[PDB]
Design a protein around this nucleic acid. Sequence first.
RNA 1: AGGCGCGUAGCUCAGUAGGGAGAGCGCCGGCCCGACACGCCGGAGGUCGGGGGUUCAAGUCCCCCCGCGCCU
Lengths: 189, 189, 189, 189, 188
Amino acid sequence: MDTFVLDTSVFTNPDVYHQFEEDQLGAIENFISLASHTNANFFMPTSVYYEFTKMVSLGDLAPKFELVVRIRSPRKWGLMVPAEFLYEFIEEVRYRINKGLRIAEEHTKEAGKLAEEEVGRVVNRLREKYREALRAGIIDSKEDVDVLLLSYELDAILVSGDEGLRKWADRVGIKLIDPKNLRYIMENL
Amino acid sequence: MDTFVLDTSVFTNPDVYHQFEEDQLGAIENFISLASHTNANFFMPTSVYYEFTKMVSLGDLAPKFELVVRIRSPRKWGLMVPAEFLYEFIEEVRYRINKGLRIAEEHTKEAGKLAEEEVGRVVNRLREKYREALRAGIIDSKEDVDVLLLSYELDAILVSGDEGLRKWADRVGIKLIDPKNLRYIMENL
Amino acid sequence: MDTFVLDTSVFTNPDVYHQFEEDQLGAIENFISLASHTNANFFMPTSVYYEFTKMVSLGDLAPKFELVVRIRSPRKWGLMVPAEFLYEFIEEVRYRINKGLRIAEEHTKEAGKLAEEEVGRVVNRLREKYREALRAGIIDSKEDVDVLLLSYELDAILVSGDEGLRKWADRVGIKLIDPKNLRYIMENL
Amino acid sequence: MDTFVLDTSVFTNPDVYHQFEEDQLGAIENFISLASHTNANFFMPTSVYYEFTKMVSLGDLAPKFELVVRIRSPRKWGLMVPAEFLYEFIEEVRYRINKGLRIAEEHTKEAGKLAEEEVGRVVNRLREKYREALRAGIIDSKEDVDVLLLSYELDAILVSGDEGLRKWADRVGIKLIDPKNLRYIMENL
Amino acid sequence: DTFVLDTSVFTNPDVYHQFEEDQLGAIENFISLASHTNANFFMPTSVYYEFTKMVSLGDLAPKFELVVRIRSPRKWGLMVPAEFLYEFIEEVRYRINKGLRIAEEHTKEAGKLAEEEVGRVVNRLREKYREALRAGIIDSKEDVDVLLLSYELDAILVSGDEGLRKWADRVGIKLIDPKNLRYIMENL
RNA sequence: AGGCGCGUAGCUCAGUAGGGAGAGCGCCGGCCCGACACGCCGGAGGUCGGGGGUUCAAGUCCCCCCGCGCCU
Ligand SMILES: [Mg+2]
Ligand SMILES: [Mg+2]
Ligand SMILES: [Mg+2]
Ligand SMILES: [Mg+2]
């Protein structure tokens, strides 16, 4: 009766998969072993599926995981989204673009007075700061769009460990859940 | 009747408005005089007009401009956009973000081998590279969305000296035009 | 009241445009002069316009052509075509694919017996046979699909000098016309 | 509850049926014996069954094969397809046709400087290159279209060793699964 | 699973040779087997009429109607695609032209023999007309009655004919092999 | 219907805990001879096949594309 759209952050972010076990290949295995007793459907987008399988390495786990989870792409030709989504997204992207320029300038001035020493450390700091400024708390990849559209079309409960995905998911129409509560709600059902 | 949607680039880009007259204000006056005798309608989004008035010294010409040209706002509440548009936009945004990160890394590495003096030239080059990498060939401001939605809603010919605006207007099916042929079109309509 | 989607062949095939004038750079001028008095709407796809302006040195006439004709791209995100248009198209392509392989083998055998000094004639014959066996009587380019969809969604009268496109336009229900009587139709409308 | 639409590649490709037994007849017999206990419905297009029976000699297997697998053709009279699918198919087909024409031109040149000796191996190389250039990675038959349409209509899990079929099925939103996992699914469901 | 029976199942010798080599024990064997298999057997009531006229069945009709079910398709609540009529019209026109050609050929061939061997010529014309206008196509209303009973019940059509399986495949209906009917019934 | 492997100077390759882009050869200067050469100083020689990603650092680690060969 209930459908759950899954994202790779469930099996990637440490804070969310610790419900089952304190190990990636143990938490995934425990999720597999008990999801077969749940009276619910599980759906994962196709793009995020191989994104997941290229991040984590599975042995005798891909067969069972494909058995319990139905991989399927959204039907991205009959789906429509409001024009207010585009406005907010483009304004947020423009706001975050200017912030990246400031960080780049600050790091190019900081490294401009070090005289060829510890420049690598400045680059390491710049990478983290720029990535956090540009790709944190927002939808950044087409995989997030795929998850959003699958949740929209299928009218399911989105289970995502991210933070920017939940914001836009609740923005459009999607019902969400706390990923820390998966092992309880999905066990009771 | 023929309806046109104007943009800032018509009076901003010199290559566009040189068909009227060499100087900006003279070209705008020529455009006003020609449009006062043309059997056609002209529109411009409210935010686009706001940025036009605060960028150009529109003195003694604002009354005539508001006379010939009608300033409107897109009705975003009753407008919907395809999902593939958002998909392509997000993919392009991610690609440009990666390009900007590469440019920032290159410029910070360059500035680390040049000591505390002459850093300003490196910063200026970093700005002129990052802005062109992240804002050329794509819709970046919320006024471009206003131009796109007003043209898509009024079924009007879009006039714009930009290149990303035309690129993303061909993606939705908006009638376009060459900005340098506008004058000859207005003298025969 | 009447919409006429145009194709490149109208200005490319000598027999089609001889109804206007004997020269390709004079027939277009006559068409623009006549279409300025016709009580009908004209349309050409964006890609078709790009291809037409690339194969013809449109100088001093492009403003006149854009004054009369409307350049617009189809909104293919909503249109649904029947599966029978795709099933009965895939078989034709596969049948033509096997024909090209036989032609290539025949020409390789024919070039292997002369063995010298005449490979150019064999190459030219292979080019012509391959082109006529895979690009004759069927829709091949993506511009033809653009014309088809623009005529379908606008419910317009297709005016194309092709035969491979006019045959598949009938398969959808598009009001086809004979391209050699465009001038008489325009002169009375 | 679950539905599986099979393709000929499941029993033809050695890398797929080796999970059953190292023998085509043995693999088919093992699949038939195992499918009699699983809680799933298997379907195959009629045009695909024709090709399957024309490539394998089934003795005492076809009566057993018809026991488990329900042969049925797609009901294509009421199955709309997206218009952008046709656009991608046309552009990719044109790309591959252009790629094969130059392959044929290269091979006729290579055979035109070798005399009447060793022409057969050149012809064989031309055949292999033409096949892999114009057929690999694309939908190239009406059997594949039947599998895709049947899977779309019944909302089933598409099983097929062909990768072009899966790649073009992902564009429509069909539940795709890895063929090599198929066996493990059957003893689990 | 539900099947749809036809006259050709019990009239064509190659079809009922699975049960017995006699068209009065094949039906008995089919009834005995169907009294054990877990399946539903349906046949249109317009098809059961032909099964009773062309075949004289006695002491077996009670068993048959006990183990088989008879119903007519509810054609008042059914729809047919519009391109079915196009294919049917084209095939009918082509077959009509072929039949006219055959009739002309058989008239010209007998116009040379004057009054001699006319009966054999007429018999040959009968056979040619039958095999050129009533083979490989739906011709009677008892064929549409089989097509619409499986289109509406989602059943596996069982028929020894060839013109039934050419148009049953054109509207997406399951198609069993008529010679294997005994085996699957044994396993179901 | 697929799986295995290779792409590094004028040619054929050695190249990895990621911390050089070189060589056996061809060979213009060189040594080497009264004398281009032999043993023997070395010029010159780059798309590490093309795009990206992760790292202070990529021929190396990770994905896509192109080309050349072996097994079904
Ligand atoms: Mg992701
Ligand atoms: Mg064309
Ligand atoms: Mg195939
Ligand atoms: Mg196939």
